[PDB]
Amino acid sequence: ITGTSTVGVGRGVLGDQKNINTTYSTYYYLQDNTRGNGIFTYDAKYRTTLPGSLWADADNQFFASYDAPAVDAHYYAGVTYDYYKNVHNRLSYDGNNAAIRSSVHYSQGYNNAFWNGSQMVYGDGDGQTFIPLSGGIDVVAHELTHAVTDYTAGLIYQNESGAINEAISDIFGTLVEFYANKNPDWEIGEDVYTPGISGDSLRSMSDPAKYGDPDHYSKRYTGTQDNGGVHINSGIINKAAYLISQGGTHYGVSVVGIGRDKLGKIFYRALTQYLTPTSNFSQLRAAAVQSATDLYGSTSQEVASVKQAFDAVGVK
Ligand SMILES: [Ca+2]
Ligand SMILES: [Ca+2]
Ligand SMILES: [Ca+2]
Ligand SMILES: [Ca+2]
Ligand SMILES: [Zn+2]
């Protein structure tokens, strides 16, 4: 809507206070005009109809429990936009400042969040398995990254290409978590997963096997469930990414870590310049090696580490 840009205050899912950009026109709306064509957050009111109604508030204060998921979805979409703009010089997910829209309170007891090709959608969780999913910055960044992938490589959500699609979202979801310096780690969804159990997460990039996910190509899932194991086989790529950044010895293969910043630069270039809709693991390796070569030279330590990491997870 058309109005005056202002700043409100609220509390997120985890009870932390934060300032959020809003727009005033009779009501205060969750519309951030400071980033690209804007960030808009909607209330799905427990229904499955999208996007719902643009979030309206009477006093620009968002401290009600019902407001929490909206506060975080709005705020973290902003942080993710900042990450892509400041670190990769990319304006929004399409590279042309496309408006970012999110709907919260989707359905009832919905234990998931997703990018549907047009916008982000967040369930509130059932309170046991998950609490409102927008409370996890890595989750928000994971989903928005699917938008970036859709507009670039266009990886099909099936089999190996789908696993790469998922891994890319986990990788950048984690890099954004580090960017915001919000208790960063290499785990996925730890802030909103199982509130009654501490120390766990949905997936682990440092050790995928901790939750039963493969950490080597020889252990890849070849079934048909989960669209060919897109959330399962992603562990193979996630482990490779973790090794490239942090280093370590995996299955007898040693990798010298090159850091998170270079990891991000290498994968962003691979994603935007070399990957295609049907790229498989072997092609991702080639794309990553070529990207590191473009950026640091064929005889660089960076290229060596990328090769070692993929060798460690068995991807030739
Ligand atoms: Ca209010
Ligand atoms: Ca964390
Ligand atoms: Ca995390
Ligand atoms: Ca937990
Ligand atoms: Zn995903």
Curated annotation (Swiss-Prot):
Reaction(s) catalysed by this chain's protein: Preferential cleavage: Xaa-|-Leu > Xaa-|-Phe
Binding residues annotated for Ca(2+) 4, in chain numbering: Y193, T194, I197, D200
Entry keywords, A to Z: Calcium, Hydrolase, Metal-binding, Metalloprotease, Protease, Secreted, Signal, Zinc, Zymogen
Binding site for Ca(2+) 3: E177, N183, D185, E190
Gene Ontology cellular component terms for the protein in this record: extracellular region
Annotated localization: Secreted
Binding note for cofactor: Binds 4 Ca(2+) ions per subunit.
Coiled-coil residues: none
Cofactor(s) recorded in Swiss-Prot or TrEMBL: Ca(2+); Zn(2+)
Sites where the protein binds Ca(2+) 2: D138, E177, D185, E187, E190
Entry's EC annotation: 3.4.24.27
Entry annotation: catalytic residues: E143, H231 (proton donor)
Keyword Cell inner membrane: no
A GO biological-process term: proteolysis
Highest taxon, organism lineage: Bacteria
Amino-acid positions noted as binding Zn(2+) in the UniProt annotation, renumbered to this chain: H142, H146, E166
Role according to the record: Extracellular zinc metalloprotease.
Family to which this protein belongs: Belongs to the peptidase M4 family.
Protein name stated in the entry: Thermolysin
Organism: Bacillus thermoproteolyticus
Species lineage: Bacteria, Bacillati, Bacillota, Bacilli, Bacillales
Gene this chain is encoded by: npr
